Write a protein that binds this ligand. Structure first.
Ligand SMILES: *C/C=C(C)/C=C/C=C(C)/C=C/C1=C(C)CCCC1(C)C
Length: 227
């Protein structure tokens, strides 16, 4: 076919593939057991994004959903990707500040609701209900951010400054990048259709890559990962 944003899918697959190998390589030359924990988790995040980007580049994970008088193109492979990568990122932040089991389970659960309702909204045919789902998905997100900001940050103070300070950088990159997603969804293909798919795809890879490979790098090159 050759859709305009394939170029962006091509750069997403590429960046994610590099990050994967570099983390893999760096992670298997590490003997520390906790370092090993963070490395296994993080190195798992980019490959999952890689395959989902590949398929899309190659033509899968796309479906035409009717609404607005149009047959709209929704890249659902995007959710099959985030469903597994967002909770692995949360877990990565949660292990850092020694979050409790209830917090994690709730952060991950809340995270399950967000990608699920978001997907249901991306699939919904009554135009206005799409925004209802989008609404529930976003509120689930605000709960997660509130927890990362209010809860986690507090427990990171029971950690060394090197640890509390690697966390606030990662928590900040997460608050800023996550904040953007619901807005992209809104003004683009899933929502208003103001921003065309090709610019939306570009916006999405820039965030996906910053939030994954960007997040991983900062985390795995830190000394705070060591037990
Ligand atoms: C590697 C991928 C990351 C860090 C993805 C983060 C994705 C989000 C924070 C997505 C959020 C969404 C909403 C708040 C509502 C509408 C639909 C979503 C799934 C785009």
């Amino acid at each position: 076919t050759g859709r305009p944003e394939w170029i962006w899918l091509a750069l997403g697959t590429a960046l994610m593939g590099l990050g994967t190998l570099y983390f893999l390589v760096k992670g298997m030359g590490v003997s520390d057991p906790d370092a090993k924990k963070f490395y296994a988790i993080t190195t798992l995040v980019p490959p999952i994004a890689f395959t989902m980007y590949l398929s899309m580049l190659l033509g899968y994970g796309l479906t035409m959903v009717p609404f607005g008088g149009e047959q709209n193109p929704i890249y659902w492979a995007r959710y099959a990707d985030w469903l597994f990568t967002t909770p692995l990122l949360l877990l990565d932040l949660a292990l850092l500040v020694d979050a409790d089991q209830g917090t994690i389970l709730a952060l991950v659960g809340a995270d399950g609701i967000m990608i699920g309702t978001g997907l249901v909204g991306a699939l919904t045919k009554v135009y206005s209900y799409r925004f209802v789902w989008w609404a529930i998905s976003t509120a689930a997100m605000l709960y997660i951010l509130y927890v990362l900001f209010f809860g986690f940050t507090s427990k990171a103070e029971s950690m060394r400054p090197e640890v509390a300070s690697t966390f606030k950088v990662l928590r900040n990159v997460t608050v800023v990048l996550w904040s953007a997603y619901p807005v992209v969804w809104l003004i683009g293909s899933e929502g208003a259709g103001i921003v065309p798919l090709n610019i939306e795809t570009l916006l999405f890879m820039v965030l996906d890559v910053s939030a994954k490979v960007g997040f991983g790098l900062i985390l795995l090159r830190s000394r705070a990962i060591f037990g």
